[PDB]
Every structure is written in C-alpha cells, then in structure tokens.
Design a protein around this ligand. Structure first.
Ligand SMILES: O=C(O)CNC(=O)C(=O)O
Ligand SMILES: [Mg+2]
Ligand code: NI
Ligand SMILES: [Zn+2]
Length: 331
C-alpha cells in the first residue's frame, strides 16, 4: 500500500505532465496521495495562471462575512455576520489596516501559534464564496474554469444525464480568516489555487480516519450534535491541533503559498486559516473513484447546511432513499 502513514505529498509535475489533469490526479493516487486527504501541486516553472493581478481591484465582494467566534481558544464555533458590500481594493486596504493586519512574527510556526492563541478574540472579514475566475481564458493547463464537470463525470460513469452546473469560486482572505472543519459537498474532491498574497495553512484528517474526527466533534459540540446528525456540514466548528493531538486524532498540516495548488480528496476533513491578504480560487470535481464516496456521503437534513442547486441531482441519483428527507431540509 502506497503512503501507509497518510502523509501529505507534494508533487512537481513537468509541463508535459501538466497537460492532462485527470491523468495526473490518477497518478497522484497511484502514489498514495489520497490517503492523506490533501496534496500540494507545484506547477511547472513555465506555467502561469494569468499575466498579472494588477487589475482586480474592481471585483465586488457583495456580502463580506465577519467571522465571529464563540467558545475557547482551541474549541470554538464561528458565525458569519453579513457586512456591506465592498470592492477587492477596499477589502485589501481593510486587511492591511492596523486593526486587521498580520502581526509581526518570526516564521510560519510562530504565526500558527499566534493564530491558535488569539483567533477567538478577533472577528476577521472573509470575502468568500464569490462565483468567478481569475484564470486567463488562454491558460490551457489546470484552468479551474475549464475542468470536466461533475455532471459529465456522473453521466460517463453511471449513464444518467442530469441537470446542474459546476463553476469556480473566489475567496479573498485576511489575517485570521478561517475555514471550519468540513468535507466537500457529497464528499467530492476540491482543488484550490492560491492566486496571490499571503499563505493559507491547512489541517487535514486522512479519509480512513474521518469518523474519529466526527466522534470527537460530537463530544466537543454536544448541543450541535443533538441538533443534527451531520452538523460538520454546517461549516462552523473549529478544533485546534493541540486538541486533536490530546485526543489522539490523526491529522497533518501544511502551508500553501501563492502560486501553488492544493487538492482535497473525497472524505478528507480539512480546516485552516489565512496569514494575511490573499485571493484563492477553488472548485469541486469528481473522478471515477469518487462515486462510491458520493453514495455514502452524510447529509444535513436539519436545514442549516443549505447548498447549491446542483447537489439535488447528486442526492437524487446516488442516494434515492435519503432524497425525500434531504430535500425537506432544503425547502
Ligand atoms: O480556502 C478556503 O477558505 C476554503 N477552501 C476549501 O475548503 C477548499 O478549497 O476545499
Ligand atoms: Mg477589477
Ligand atoms: Ni473545502
Ligand atoms: Zn444540519
């Protein structure tokens, strides 16, 4: 078995190897990369996502989210308070203000210590989940707006044509902006490209050990657990590395820098935080290996998780028994 300790693997494809996206994912999996739940891909030196970032300031962040925490430093939830619209140039200036900017620090480890010590005492503002792309249309390789769609993958594997579309999302971050512990919708893959700015630190639980994280979460968030049998689908709970180590949960960590891709694998729980002003682009995708994960994915039916139009068909075809109850949650 390749990668039996479930370490995060880092790949350096050549420009020739960067042509065929599906083939390269399958290669990484041949080497055991999926066992970690997360992999890093450093693009060939010849590749670029676009020519410059000099003209992005007029993108609108229609609904910036202030991420307000409750709990203790290592075990907390966050809720998202909607703020007034602002442009990316206005958000960048905010991120760089004395109230929100990254503190002085020695290295990524010192910054990580400061994040876990102090996150709960601040409410950073995240421009998350913005439909759009920063890849140039002429970028042919690993262009997250030109991937094969999940609907087409389901159709190729299972023969059933379904409605729905699959487009990317932009994320504008600042110091302390936080992504809570989650797997993807329908336990899909994700791919995330850090276009510019400061790093993003990731934490990940191997897919084979995901249920250990779920059991800990039920213990740490006991009211939430009674409310919903899949409350991590709400994307609000944070647990620190120190707490995970105290409770014996297997996990790994890595920091993504500008110009790098990350792939999350089916049922790979992940969480993390931004170091400072940045912009990322991410999208879900599928492979043949995902289908069995999609069939088994948990679902929130309490009403909180509320997701996209396109998840309907995935539930309806892969999980027909759950469909009725899940759809009640959506309506
Ligand atoms: O970058 C973020 O805030 C969150 N991204 C992801 O969870 C992802 O790419 O799967
Ligand atoms: Mg612009
Ligand atoms: Ni994710
Ligand atoms: Zn729920």
């Amino acid at each position: 078995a390749q990668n039996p300790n479930c370490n995060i693997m880092i790949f350096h494809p050549t420009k020739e190897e960067f042509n065929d996206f599906d083939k390269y994912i399958a290669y990484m999996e041949s080497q055991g990369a999926h066992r970690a739940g997360l992999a890093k891909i450093i693009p060939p030196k010849e590749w670029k996502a676009r020519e410059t970032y000099d003209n992005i300031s007029e993108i609108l962040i229609a609904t910036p989210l202030q991420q307000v925490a409750s709990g203790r430093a290592g075990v907390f939830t966050q809720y998202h308070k909607k703020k007034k619209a602002m442009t990316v140039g206005e958000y960048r200036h905010l991120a760089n203000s004395k109230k929100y900017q990254t503190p002085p620090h020695q290295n990524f480890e010192d910054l990580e210590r400061k994040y876990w010590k102090n996150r709960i005492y601040n409410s950073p503002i995240y421009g998350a989940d913005i439909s759009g792309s920063l890849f140039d249309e002429n970028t042919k390789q690993w262009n997250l707006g030109h991937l094969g769609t999940i609907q087409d993958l389901l159709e190729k594997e299972c023969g059933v044509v379904i409605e729905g579309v699959n487009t990317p999302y932009l994320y504008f971050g600042m110091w302390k902006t936080t992504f809570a512990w989650h797997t993807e919708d329908m336990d899909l893959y994700s791919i995330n490209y850090l276009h510019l700015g400061e790093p993003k630190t990731w934490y990940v639980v191997p897919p084979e050990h995901g249920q250990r994280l779920e059991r800990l979460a039920r213990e740490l968030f006991p009211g939430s657990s009674r409310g919903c049998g899949a409350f991590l689908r709400h994307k609000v709970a944070l647990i620190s590395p120190t707490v995970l180590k105290e409770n014996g949960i297997p996990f790994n960590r890595i920091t993504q820098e500008a110009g790098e891709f990350m792939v999350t694998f089916p049922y790979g729980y992940h969480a993390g935080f931004n170091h400072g002003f940045n912009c990322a682009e991410a999208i879900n995708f599928a492979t043949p290996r995902w289908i069995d994960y999609g069939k088994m994915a948990s679902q929130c039916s309490c009403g909180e998780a509320r997701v996209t139009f396109s998840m309907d068909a995935f539930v309806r075809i892969l999980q027909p028994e759950r469909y009725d109850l899940w759809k009640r949650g959506q309506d």
